[PDB]
Short mmCIF file of C-alpha atoms in Angstrom, two decimals:
data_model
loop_
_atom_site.label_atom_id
_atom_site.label_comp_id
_atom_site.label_asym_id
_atom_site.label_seq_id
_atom_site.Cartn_x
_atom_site.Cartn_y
_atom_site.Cartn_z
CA UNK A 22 221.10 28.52 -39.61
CA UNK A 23 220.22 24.75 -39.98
CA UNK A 24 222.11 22.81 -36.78
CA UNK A 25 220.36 25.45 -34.26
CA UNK A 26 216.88 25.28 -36.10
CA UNK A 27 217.14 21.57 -35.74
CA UNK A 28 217.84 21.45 -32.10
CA UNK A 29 215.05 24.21 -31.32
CA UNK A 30 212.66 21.80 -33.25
CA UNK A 31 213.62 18.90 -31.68
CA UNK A 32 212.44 20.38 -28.33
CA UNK A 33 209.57 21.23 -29.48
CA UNK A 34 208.43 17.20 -30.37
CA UNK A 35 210.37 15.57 -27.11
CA UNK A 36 209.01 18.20 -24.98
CA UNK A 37 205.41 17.09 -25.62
CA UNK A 38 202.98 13.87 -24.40
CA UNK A 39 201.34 11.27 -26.21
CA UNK A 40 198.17 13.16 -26.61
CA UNK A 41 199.80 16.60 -27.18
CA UNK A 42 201.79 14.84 -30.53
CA UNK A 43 199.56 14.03 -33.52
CA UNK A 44 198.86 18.17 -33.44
CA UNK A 45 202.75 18.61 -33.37
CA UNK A 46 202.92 16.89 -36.57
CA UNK A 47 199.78 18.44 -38.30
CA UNK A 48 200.98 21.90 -37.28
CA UNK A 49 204.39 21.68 -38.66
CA UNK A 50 203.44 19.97 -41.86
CA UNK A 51 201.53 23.35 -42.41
CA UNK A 52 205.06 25.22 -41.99
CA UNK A 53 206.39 22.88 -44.56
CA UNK A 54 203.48 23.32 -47.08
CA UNK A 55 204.16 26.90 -46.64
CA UNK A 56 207.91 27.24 -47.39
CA UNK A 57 207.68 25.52 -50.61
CA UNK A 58 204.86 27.72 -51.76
CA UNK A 59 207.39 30.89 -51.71
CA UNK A 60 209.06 28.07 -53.83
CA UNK A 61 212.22 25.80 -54.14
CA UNK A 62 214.44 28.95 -54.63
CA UNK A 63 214.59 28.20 -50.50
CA UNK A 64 215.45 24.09 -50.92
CA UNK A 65 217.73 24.38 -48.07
CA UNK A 66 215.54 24.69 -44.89
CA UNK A 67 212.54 22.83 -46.32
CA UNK A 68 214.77 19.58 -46.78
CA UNK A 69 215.10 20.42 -43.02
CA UNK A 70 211.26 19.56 -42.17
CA UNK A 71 210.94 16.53 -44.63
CA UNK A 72 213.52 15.03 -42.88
CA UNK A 73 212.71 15.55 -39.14
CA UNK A 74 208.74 14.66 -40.16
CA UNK A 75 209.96 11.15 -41.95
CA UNK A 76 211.93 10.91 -38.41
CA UNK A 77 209.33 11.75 -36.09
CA UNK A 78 206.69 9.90 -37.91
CA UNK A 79 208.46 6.87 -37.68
CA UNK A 80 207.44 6.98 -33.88
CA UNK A 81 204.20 7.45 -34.36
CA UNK A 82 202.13 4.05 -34.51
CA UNK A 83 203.62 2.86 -31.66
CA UNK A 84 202.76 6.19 -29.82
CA UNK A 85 198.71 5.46 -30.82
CA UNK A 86 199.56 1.83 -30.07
CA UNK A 87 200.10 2.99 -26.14
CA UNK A 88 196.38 4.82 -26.44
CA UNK A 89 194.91 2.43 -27.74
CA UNK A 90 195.96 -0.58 -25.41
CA UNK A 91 195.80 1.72 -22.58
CA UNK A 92 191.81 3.40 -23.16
CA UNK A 93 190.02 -0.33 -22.95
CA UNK A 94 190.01 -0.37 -19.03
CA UNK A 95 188.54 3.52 -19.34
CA UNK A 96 185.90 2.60 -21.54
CA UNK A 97 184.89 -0.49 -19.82
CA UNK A 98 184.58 1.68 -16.99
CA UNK A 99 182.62 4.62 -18.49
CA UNK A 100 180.09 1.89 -20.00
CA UNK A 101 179.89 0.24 -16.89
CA UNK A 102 178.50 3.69 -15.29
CA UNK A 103 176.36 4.42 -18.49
CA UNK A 104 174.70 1.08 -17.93
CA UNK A 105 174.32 1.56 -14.21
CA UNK A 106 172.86 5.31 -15.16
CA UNK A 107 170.41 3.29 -17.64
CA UNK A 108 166.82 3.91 -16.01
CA UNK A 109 163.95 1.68 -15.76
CA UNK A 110 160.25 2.56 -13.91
CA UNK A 111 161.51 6.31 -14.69
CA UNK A 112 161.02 7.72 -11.43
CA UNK A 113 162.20 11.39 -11.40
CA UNK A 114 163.31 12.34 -7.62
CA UNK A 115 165.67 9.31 -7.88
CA UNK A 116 166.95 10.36 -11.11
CA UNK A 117 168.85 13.70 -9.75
CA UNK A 118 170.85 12.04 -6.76
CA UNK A 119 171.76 9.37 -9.86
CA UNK A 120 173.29 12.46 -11.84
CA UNK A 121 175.37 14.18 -9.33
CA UNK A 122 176.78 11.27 -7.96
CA UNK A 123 177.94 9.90 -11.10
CA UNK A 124 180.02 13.14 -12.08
CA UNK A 125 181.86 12.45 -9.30
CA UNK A 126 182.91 9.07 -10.65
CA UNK A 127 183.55 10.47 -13.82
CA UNK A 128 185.87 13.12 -12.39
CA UNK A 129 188.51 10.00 -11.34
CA UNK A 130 188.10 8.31 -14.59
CA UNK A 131 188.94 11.16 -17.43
CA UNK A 132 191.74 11.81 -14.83
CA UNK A 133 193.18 8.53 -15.87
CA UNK A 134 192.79 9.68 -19.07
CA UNK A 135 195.17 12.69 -17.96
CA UNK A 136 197.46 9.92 -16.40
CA UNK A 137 198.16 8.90 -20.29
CA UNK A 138 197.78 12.05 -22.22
CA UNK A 139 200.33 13.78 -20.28
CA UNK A 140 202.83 10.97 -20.18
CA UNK A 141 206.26 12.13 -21.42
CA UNK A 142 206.71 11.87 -24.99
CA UNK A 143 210.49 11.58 -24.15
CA UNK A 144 210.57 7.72 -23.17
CA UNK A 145 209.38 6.61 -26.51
CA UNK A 146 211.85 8.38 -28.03
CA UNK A 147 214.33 7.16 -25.15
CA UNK A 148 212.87 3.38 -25.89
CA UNK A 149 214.50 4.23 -29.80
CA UNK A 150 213.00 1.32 -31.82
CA UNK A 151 214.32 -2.71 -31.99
CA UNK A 152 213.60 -4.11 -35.08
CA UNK A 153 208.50 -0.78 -54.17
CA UNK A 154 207.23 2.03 -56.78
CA UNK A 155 207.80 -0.32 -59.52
CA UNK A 156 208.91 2.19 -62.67
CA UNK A 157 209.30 0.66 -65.87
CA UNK A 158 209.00 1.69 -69.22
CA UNK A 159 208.95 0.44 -73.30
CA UNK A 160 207.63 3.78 -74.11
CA UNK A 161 205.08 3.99 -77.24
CA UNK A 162 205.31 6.66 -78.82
CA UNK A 163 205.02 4.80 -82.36
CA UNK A 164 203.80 6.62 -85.79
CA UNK A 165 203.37 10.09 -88.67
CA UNK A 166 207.33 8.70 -88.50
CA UNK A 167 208.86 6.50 -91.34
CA UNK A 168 211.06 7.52 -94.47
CA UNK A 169 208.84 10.72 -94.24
CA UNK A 170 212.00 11.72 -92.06
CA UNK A 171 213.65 11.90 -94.75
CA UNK A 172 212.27 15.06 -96.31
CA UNK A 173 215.35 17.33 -95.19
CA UNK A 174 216.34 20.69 -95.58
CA UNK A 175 218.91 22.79 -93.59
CA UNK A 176 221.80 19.84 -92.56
CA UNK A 177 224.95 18.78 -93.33
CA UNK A 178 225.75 17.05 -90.05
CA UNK A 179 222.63 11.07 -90.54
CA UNK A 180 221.92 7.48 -90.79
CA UNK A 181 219.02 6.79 -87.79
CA UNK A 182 218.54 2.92 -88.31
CA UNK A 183 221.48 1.03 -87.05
CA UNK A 184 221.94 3.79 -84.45
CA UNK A 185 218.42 2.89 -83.11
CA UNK A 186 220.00 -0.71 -83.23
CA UNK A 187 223.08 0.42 -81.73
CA UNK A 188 221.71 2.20 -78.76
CA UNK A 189 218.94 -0.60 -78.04
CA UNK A 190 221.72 -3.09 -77.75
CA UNK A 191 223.81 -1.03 -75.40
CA UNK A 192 220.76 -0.65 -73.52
CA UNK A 193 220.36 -4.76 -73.38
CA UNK A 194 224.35 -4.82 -72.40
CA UNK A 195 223.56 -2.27 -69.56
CA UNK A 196 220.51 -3.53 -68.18
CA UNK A 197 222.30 -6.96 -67.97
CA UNK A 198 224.76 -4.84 -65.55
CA UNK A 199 224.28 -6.19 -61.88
CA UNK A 200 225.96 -5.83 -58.34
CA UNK A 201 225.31 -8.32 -55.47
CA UNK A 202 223.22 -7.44 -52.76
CA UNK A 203 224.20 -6.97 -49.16
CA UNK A 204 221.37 -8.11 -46.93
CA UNK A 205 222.24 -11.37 -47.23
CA UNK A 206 225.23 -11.34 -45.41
CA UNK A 207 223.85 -9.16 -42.42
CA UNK A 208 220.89 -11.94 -42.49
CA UNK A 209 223.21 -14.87 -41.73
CA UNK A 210 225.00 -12.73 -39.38
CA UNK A 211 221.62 -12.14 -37.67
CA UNK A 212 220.95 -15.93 -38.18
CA UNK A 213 224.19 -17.22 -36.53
CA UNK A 214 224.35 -14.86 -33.89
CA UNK A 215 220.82 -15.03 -32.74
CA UNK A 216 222.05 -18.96 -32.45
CA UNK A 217 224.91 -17.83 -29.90
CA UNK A 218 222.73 -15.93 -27.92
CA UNK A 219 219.50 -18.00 -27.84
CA UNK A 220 221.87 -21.49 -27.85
CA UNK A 221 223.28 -20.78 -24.31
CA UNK A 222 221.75 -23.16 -21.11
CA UNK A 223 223.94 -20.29 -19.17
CA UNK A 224 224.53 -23.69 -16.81
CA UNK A 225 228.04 -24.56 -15.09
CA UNK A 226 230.94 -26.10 -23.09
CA UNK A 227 230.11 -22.48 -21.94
CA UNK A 228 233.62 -22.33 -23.04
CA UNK A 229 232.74 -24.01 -26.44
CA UNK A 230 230.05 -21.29 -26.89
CA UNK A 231 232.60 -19.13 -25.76
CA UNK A 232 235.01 -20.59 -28.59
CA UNK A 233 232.37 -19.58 -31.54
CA UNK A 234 231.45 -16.61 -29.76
CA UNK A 235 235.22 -15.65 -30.49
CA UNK A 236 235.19 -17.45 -33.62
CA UNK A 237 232.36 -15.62 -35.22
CA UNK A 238 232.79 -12.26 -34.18
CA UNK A 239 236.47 -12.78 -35.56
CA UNK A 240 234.85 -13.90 -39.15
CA UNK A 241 232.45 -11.29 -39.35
CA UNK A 242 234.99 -8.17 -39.29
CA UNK A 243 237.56 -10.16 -41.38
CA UNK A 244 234.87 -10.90 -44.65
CA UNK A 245 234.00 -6.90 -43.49
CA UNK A 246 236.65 -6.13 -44.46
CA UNK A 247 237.87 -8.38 -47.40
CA UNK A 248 235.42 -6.43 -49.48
CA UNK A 249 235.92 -2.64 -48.95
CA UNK A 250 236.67 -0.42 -45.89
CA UNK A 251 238.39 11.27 -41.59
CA UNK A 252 234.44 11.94 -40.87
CA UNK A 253 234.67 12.18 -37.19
CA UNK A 254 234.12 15.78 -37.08
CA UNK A 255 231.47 15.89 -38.97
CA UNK A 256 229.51 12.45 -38.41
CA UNK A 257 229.50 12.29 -34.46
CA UNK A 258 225.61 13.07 -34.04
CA UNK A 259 222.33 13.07 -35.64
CA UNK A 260 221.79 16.72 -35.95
CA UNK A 261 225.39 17.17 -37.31
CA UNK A 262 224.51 15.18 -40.30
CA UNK A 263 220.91 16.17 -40.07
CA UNK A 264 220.81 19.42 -41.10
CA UNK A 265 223.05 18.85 -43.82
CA UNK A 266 221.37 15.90 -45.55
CA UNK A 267 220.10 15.45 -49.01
CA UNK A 268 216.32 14.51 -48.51
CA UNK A 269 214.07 12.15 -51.00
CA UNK A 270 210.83 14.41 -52.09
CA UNK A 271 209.51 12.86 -54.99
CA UNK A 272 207.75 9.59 -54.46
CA UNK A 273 209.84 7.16 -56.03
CA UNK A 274 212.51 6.94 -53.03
CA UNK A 275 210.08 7.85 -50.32
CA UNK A 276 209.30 4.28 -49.69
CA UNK A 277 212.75 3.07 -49.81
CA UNK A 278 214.44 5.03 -47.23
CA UNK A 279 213.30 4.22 -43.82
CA UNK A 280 215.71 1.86 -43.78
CA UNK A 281 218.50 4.85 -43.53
CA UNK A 282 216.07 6.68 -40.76
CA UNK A 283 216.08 3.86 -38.70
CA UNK A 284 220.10 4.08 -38.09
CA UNK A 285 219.23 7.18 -36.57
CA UNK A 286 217.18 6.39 -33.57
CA UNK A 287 219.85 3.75 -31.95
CA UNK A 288 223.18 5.41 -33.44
CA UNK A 289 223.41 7.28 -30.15
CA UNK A 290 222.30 4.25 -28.28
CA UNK A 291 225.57 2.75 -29.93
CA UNK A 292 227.46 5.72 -28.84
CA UNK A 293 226.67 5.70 -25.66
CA UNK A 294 227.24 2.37 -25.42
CA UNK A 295 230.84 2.55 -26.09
CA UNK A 296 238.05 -5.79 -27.70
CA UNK A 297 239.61 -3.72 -30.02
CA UNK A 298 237.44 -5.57 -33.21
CA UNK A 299 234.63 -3.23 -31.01
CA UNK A 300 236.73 -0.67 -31.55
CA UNK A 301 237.64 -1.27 -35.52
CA UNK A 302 233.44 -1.79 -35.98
CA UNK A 303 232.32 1.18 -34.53
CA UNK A 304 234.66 3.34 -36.33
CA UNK A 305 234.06 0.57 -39.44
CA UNK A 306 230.69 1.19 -40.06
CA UNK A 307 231.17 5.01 -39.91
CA UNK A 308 232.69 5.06 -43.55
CA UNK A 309 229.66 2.90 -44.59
CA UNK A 310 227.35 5.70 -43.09
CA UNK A 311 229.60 8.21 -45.39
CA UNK A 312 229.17 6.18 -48.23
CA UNK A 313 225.41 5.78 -47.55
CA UNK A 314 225.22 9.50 -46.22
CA UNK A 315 227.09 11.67 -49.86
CA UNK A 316 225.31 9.63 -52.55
CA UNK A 317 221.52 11.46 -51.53
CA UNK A 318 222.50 14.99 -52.96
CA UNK A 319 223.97 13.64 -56.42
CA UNK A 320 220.62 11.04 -56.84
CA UNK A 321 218.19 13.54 -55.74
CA UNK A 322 219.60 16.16 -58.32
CA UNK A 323 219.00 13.28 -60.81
CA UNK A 324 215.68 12.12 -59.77
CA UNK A 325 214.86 16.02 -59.81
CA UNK A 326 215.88 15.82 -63.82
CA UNK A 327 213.99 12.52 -64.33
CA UNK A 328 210.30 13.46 -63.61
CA UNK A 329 210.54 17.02 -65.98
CA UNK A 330 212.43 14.78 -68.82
CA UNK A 331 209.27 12.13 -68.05
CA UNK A 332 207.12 15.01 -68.41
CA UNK A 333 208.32 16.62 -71.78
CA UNK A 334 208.86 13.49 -73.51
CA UNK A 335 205.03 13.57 -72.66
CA UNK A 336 204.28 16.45 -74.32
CA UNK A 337 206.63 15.72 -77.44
CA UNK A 338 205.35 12.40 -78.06
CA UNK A 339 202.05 14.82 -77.33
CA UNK A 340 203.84 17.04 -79.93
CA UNK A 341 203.72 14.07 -82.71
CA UNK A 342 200.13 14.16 -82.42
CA UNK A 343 199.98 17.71 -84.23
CA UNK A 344 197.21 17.86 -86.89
CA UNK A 345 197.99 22.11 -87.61
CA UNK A 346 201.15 24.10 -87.25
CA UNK A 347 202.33 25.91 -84.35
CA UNK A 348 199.70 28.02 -82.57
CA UNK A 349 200.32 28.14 -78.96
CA UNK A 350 201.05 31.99 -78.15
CA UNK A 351 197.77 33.37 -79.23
CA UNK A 352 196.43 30.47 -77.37
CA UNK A 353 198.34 31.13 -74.19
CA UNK A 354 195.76 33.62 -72.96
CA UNK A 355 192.49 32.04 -73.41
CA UNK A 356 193.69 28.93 -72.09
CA UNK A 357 193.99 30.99 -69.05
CA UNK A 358 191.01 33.13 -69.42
CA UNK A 359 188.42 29.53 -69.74
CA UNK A 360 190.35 27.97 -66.87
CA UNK A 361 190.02 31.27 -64.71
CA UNK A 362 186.18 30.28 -65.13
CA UNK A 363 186.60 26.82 -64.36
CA UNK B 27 215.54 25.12 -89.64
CA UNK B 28 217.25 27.36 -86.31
CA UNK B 29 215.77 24.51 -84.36
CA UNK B 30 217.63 22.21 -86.77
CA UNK B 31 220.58 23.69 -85.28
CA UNK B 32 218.71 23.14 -81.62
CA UNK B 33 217.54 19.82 -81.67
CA UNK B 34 220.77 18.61 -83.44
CA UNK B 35 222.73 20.11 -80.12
CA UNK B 36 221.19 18.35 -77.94
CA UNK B 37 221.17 15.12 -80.48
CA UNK B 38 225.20 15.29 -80.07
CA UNK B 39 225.21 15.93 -76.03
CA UNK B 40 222.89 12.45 -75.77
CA UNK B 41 224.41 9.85 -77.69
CA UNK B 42 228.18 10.83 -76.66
CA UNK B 43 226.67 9.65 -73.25
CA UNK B 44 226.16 6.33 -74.91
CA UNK B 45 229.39 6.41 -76.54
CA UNK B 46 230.66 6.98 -72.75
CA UNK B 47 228.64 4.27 -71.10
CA UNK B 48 229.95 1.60 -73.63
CA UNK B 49 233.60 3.67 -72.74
CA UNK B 50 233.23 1.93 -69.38
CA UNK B 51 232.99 -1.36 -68.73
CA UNK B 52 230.30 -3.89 -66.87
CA UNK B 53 230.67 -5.42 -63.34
CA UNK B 54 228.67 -8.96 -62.34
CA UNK B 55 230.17 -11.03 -55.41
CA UNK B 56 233.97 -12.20 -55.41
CA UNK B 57 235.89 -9.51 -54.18
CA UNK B 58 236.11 -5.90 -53.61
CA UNK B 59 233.16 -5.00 -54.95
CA UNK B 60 230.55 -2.97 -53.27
CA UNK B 61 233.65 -0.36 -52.53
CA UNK B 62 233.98 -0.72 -56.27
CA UNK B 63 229.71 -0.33 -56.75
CA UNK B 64 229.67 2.47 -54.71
CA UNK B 65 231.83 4.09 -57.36
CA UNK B 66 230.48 2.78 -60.36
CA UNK B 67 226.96 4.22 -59.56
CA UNK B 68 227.93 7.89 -58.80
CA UNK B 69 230.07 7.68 -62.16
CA UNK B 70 227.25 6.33 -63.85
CA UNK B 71 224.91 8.74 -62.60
CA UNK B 72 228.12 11.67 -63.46
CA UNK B 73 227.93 10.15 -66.74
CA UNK B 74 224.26 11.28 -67.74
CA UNK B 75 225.16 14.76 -67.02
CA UNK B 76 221.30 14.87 -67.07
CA UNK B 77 221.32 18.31 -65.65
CA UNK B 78 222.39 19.67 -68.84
CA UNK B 79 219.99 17.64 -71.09
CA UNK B 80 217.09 18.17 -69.48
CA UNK B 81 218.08 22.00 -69.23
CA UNK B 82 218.98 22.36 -73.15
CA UNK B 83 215.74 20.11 -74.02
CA UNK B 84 213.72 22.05 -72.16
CA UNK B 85 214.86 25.54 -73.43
CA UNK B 86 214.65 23.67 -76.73
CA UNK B 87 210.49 23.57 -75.57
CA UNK B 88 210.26 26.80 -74.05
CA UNK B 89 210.41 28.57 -77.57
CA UNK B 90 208.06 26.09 -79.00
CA UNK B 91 204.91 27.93 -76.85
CA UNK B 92 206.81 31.29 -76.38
CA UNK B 93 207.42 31.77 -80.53
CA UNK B 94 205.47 29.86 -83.14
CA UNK B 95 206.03 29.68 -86.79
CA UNK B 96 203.30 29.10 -89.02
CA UNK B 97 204.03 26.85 -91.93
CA UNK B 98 207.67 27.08 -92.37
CA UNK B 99 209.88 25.09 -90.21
CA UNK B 100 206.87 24.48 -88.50
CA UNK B 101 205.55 21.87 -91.36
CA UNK B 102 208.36 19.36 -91.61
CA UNK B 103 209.40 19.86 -88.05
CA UNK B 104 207.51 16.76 -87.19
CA UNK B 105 209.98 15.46 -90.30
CA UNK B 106 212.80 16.18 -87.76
CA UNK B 107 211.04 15.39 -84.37
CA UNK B 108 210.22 12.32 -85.99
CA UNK B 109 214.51 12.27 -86.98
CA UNK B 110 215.40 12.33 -82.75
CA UNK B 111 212.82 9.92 -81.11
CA UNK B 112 213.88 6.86 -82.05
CA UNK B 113 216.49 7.76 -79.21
CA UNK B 114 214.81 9.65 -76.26
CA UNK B 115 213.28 6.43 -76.19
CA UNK B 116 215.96 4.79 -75.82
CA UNK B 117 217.81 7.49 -73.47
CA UNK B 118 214.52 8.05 -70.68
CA UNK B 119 214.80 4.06 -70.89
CA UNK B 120 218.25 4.23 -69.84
CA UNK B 121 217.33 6.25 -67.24
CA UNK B 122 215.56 4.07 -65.29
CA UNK B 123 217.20 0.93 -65.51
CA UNK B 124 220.18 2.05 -63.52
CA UNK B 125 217.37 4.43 -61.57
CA UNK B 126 215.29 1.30 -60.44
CA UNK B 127 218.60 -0.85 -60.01
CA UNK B 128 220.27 1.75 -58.00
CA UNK B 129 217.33 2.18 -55.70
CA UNK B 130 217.43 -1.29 -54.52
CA UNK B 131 220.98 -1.13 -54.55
CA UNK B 132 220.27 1.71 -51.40
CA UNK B 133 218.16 -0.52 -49.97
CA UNK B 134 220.04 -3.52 -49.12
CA UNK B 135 222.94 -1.74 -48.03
CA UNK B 136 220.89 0.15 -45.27
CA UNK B 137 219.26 -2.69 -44.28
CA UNK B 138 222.50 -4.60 -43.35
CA UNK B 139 223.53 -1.66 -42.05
CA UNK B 140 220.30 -1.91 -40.08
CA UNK B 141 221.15 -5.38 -38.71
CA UNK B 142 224.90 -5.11 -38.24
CA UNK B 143 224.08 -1.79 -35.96
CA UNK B 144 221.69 -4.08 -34.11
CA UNK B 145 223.98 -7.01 -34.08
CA UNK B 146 226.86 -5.05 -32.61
CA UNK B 147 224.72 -2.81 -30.20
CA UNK B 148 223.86 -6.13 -28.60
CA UNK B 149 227.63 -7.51 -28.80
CA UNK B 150 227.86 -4.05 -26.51
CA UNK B 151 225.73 -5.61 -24.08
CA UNK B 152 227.69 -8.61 -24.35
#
């Protein structure tokens, strides 16, 4: 169901031009608009869409940035014939001649136009690509409460003050829980080995280079693995691992993932491309894409509970705000009925 | 008074959770330990078992709007809601400092990943 519907789709984009894109885009958003309105009952083929958009979409400044550099000799050009067609000591008979001649001029120069629009969308793709929400909360929902608690009344089954204590502390324990980052690492990498390969003359101590050429690409696989490190069959392409992957809907992790989307576009590059440290690497990093890959489905599920929790303890702290009793019911028509003529 | 019974069984699902965060320990870059975070996250996130509490807190709503009572166990029920908010508090709270911290914690990963895929693609061409 999902592996063939992405590789139909993914004609459907790379067999297209420049100019024949944006609508792509805007069309299919409209398919995935539609299949959660019969609802998330069907969450397994709207995932689908969210993810090939967020992969698509990446592409698609640096599609309008080929337009845009590449329309400034066209409309030079077509003002340069509107200012030639501008008239002075009007002059009627010579007007005519003036028109018909210029539509032939025009003819050549929306053709250019052509020349771009229906350039191959494919080559961008081909090309690949080289190179926070901020949620908090202290949450005030504040008296109504004090000893007045205390007025029970059906239980047998509580102290609430240390416990308040107790549970705050934990929470100053827990929030002082940290890992190290990563991106550090990668950085220098980047740093060290942009040196190598921008510190060569290339002139006939190429050797030396040669020695920390050796001596870095050794290093960087041994601290690899010094801290951590069968998917094969299942992570060999992107549309393998595409239509099976947990997708980011809510906006708290849709700004924090195109950094995962990004592997994407080269990771075939990298398989085509393929001592025996290349060999350890390529399969190395594989395990890393697992690891990076299986956590989406468990932290969208609890992203999915976080907003409706955020929600009710909304309405309860809503709830503590009560001035009556309990009259909702009754209400739950009329609500409806004044909104209907809203 | 029956949603004595309800809102004290979902008062007994939440702080066991705390009583099982504080049953495992805390990590501070040494050794071994992003195939160790990797591991503590997803049983930190197992740990909240959130799709039971928000599924047993919300069915503790739903009869809130679907039934009403008038003024009996409707009168001192904001005695007991007032009894098991010192905590949610506490709990959504929790919920976001591992939420926010994990979310980074994606981030940098993917990003190395980023480089070290761009670092070895052009070791390819080397």
């Amino acid at each position: 169901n999902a592996t063939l519907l992405v590789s139909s789709l993914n004609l459907f984009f790379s067999k297209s031009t420049l100019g024949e894109f944006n609508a792509r885009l805007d069309l299919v958003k409209a398919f995935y608009k539609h299949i959660q309105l019969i609802g998330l009952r069907s969450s397994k083929i709207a995932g689908l869409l969210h993810n090939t958009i967020k992969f698509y979409y990446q592409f698609k400044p640096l599609i309008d940035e080929r337009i845009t550099n590449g329309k400034k000799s066209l409309e030079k050009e077509i003002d340069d014939i509107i200012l030639l067609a501008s008239w002075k000591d009007v002059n009627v008979d010579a007007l005519k001649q003036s028109s018909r001649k210029s539509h032939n001029n025009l003819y050549k120069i929306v053709r250019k136009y052509r020349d771009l629009l229906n350039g191959d969308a494919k080559t961008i793709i081909e090309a690949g690509l080289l190179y926070y929400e901020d949620p908090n909360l202290e949450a005030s929902k504040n008296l109504v409460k004090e000893i007045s608690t205390w007025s029970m009344r059906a239980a047998p089954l509580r102290n609430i003050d240390t416990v308040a204590s107790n549970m705050d502390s934990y929470l100053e324990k827990i929030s002082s829980q940290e890992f190290p980052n990563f991106a550090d690492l990668a950085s220098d990498f980047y740093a060290e080995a942009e040196r190598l390969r921008k510190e060569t003359p290339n002139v006939y101590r190429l050797a030396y280079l040669k020695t920390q050429k050796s001596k870095l690409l050794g290093d960087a696989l041994k601290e690899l693995r010094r801290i951590g490190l069968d998917i094969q069959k299942v992570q060999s392409s992107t549309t393998t691992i595409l239509a099976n992957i947990a997708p980011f809907n809510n906006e708290y992790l849709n700004s924090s993932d195109a950094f995962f989307f990004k592997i994407l576009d080269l990771l075939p590059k990298l398989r085509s491309a393929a001592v025996a440290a290349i060999e350890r690497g390529m399969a190395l990093a594989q395990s890393l894409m697992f690891s990076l890959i299986t956590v989406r489905h468990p932290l969208s599920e609890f992203t999915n509970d976080y907003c409706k929790i955020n929600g009710m303890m909304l309405d309860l702290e809503h709830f503590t705000c009560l001035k009556g009793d309990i009259v909702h019911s009754s209400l739950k028509a009329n609500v409806d009925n004044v909104r209907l003529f809203e | 008074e029956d949603v004595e019974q309800a809102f004290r069984r979902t008062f007994t699902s939440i702080i066991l959770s705390f009583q099982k965060v504080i049953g495992d320990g805390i990590e501070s870059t040494d050794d071994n330990w992003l195939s160790a975070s990797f591991k503590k996250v997803m049983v930190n996130v197992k740990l909240l078992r959130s799709s039971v509490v928000s599924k047993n807190i919300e069915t503790a709503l739903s009869l809130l709007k679907d039934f009403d009572f008038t003024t009996t166990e409707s009168i001192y029920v904001k005695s007991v809601i007032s009894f098991t908010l010192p905590v949610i508090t506490r709990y959504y709270n929790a919920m976001t400092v591992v939420l926010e911290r994990s979310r980074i914690y994606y981030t940098n990963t993917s990003r190395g990943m980023y480089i070290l895929s761009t670092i070895l693609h052009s070791l390819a061409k080397n």
